[PDB]
Amino acid sequence: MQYLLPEAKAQDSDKICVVIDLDETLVHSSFKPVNNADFIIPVEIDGVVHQVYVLKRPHVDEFLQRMGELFECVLFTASLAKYADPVADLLDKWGAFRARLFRESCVFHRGNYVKDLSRLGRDLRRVLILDNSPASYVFHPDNAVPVASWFDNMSDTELHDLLPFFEQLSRVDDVYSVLRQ
Numbered sequence: 737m738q739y740l741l742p743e744a745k746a747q748d749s750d751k752i753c754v755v756i757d758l759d760e761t762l763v764h765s766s767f768k769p770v771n772n773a774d775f776i777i778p779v780e781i782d783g784v785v786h787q788v789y790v791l792k793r794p795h796v797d798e799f800l801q802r803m804g805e806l807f808e809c810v811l812f813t814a815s816l817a818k819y820a821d822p823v824a825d826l827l828d829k830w831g832a833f834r835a836r837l838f839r840e841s842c843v844f845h846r847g848n849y850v851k852d853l854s855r856l857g858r859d860l861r862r863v864l865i866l867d868n869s870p871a872s873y874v875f876h877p878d879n880a881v882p883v884a885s886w887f888d889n890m891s892d893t894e895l896h897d898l899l900p901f902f903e904q905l906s907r908v909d910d911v912y913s914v915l916r917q
């Protein structure tokens with residue numbers, strides 16, 4: 737199989753590659769109207785245009801800008817591009833995402849959309865995945881940075897609290913020495 741990512745830019749060759757999830761990690765979307773939504777976009781489903789209300793997780797702007805500076809960031813979602821692409825366009829104002837991967841790039845393993853990290857084409861000692869669903873990284877439990885699922889708690893500070901830990905990881909030679917494998 738062809739790797740999911742191209743050759744790393746010279747500047748990113750020695751940086752860690754971070755696979756970042758979309759739903760319940762950076763945002764929370766819904767078909768039922770929500771007051772004070774950040775994005776309200778059209779998504780076609782079976783020929784009918786539906787309005788999708790998207791809420792941004794607190795501190796996502798600070799998070800993405802910082803992560804984009806520290807690592808070779810990659811958006812990897814199990815959702816379809818017709819939805820994720822527009823959301824990513826509205827989210828990434830710093831070109832933090834070096835690449836965007838959707839549903840088709842996941843491997844449907846034992847009923848779940850798994851994100852096979854070996855599939856990226858990056859040294860596993862230099863790869864991290866931020867996903868609220870441990871099922872997503874069943875093949876790479878030791879490359880994960882645990883993160884809580886978010887829905888609408890505007891008091892949430894997980895993204896802000898995770899930066900210190902990512903800062904730490906950006907300075908180690910092998911993420912396994914920290915995550916432990």
Ligand SMILES: [Mg+2]
Pocket residue numbers: 757758759760761867868869
């Ligand atoms: Mg998710």
